[PDB]
Amino acid sequence: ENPASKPTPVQDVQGDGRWMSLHHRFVADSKDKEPEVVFIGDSLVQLMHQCEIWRELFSPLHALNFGIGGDSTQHVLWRLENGELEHIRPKIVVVWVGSNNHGHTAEQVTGGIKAIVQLVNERQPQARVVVLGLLPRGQHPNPLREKNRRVNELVRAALAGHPRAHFLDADPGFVHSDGTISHHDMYDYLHLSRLGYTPVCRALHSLLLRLL
């Protein structure tokens, strides 16, 4: 066990059962809808649906957003196994996870993203799979920048020979010459502003359009 690729649900240590409620609504979405794109991942996936204009770029494409703030790779794995891929036949699955895998080496997080791609390839063999690169983070140079850049290296080399697996680097150049990330792009140096989402979402919406 890489802990990153061992499927496990987020345990409720708070009391309000929200994670599980999120997961059950997505399962019910899958039972009742027929998306062509399913988006899955952590809060950069999740807030794209609020905080981007999803409705203009991504709703036309017939698209479910199954992002869950705080998810690591292994949580996304558990949710694809436990009913979020039932009853559906997407053409494309977009995956954006790995920046919450705290305490996991870049090689373990890469192993996590590879297990996600593998599960999607078995459970939904017709779909293309898109993996987004992990964005830089923090206001200044720090070790999670180099973690995320190393995951992106190891992931892009892993996907390089998959005909229907696409790695996408959506970073527009968020880190400036002086090393800084501006809070106009990322209000807390991790999560994207409305401004930060635009270039990200049009790099993805293009890729989505070529594929589809």
| 169 a catalytic residue | no
Rounded to the nearest whole angstrom, what is the least distance from the CB of residue 69 to a second copy in the complex?
6
The single residue of 5, 30, 43, 72 carrying the catalytic annotation is 43
Reading the block at residue 41, the tokens are 């991942």
Rounded to the nearest whole angstrom, what is the least distance from the CB of residue 199 to a second copy in the complex?
17
Rounded to the nearest whole angstrom, what is the least distance from the CB of residue 49 to a second copy in the complex?
8
Tell me the helix, strand and coil percentages in the chain, rounded to 5.
45, 10, 45
| 43 a catalytic residue | yes
85 in Cβ contact with 30 (< 8 Å) = yes
Cβ-based nearer residue to a second copy, 138 or 199: 138
Contact flag: residue 210 with a second copy (CB under 8 A)? no
174 in Cβ contact with 186 (< 8 Å) = yes
Q: Which residues are CB-neighbours of 135 under 8 A, at least 6 positions away?
A: 44, 99, 148, 170, 171, 174, 186, 192, 200
Contact flag: residue 189 with a second copy (CB under 8 A)? yes
The residue ranges that bind a second copy (CB under 8 A) are 13-18, 21-22, 25, 46, 49-51, 68-69, 102, 137-140, 142-145, 147, 183, 187-190, 193-194
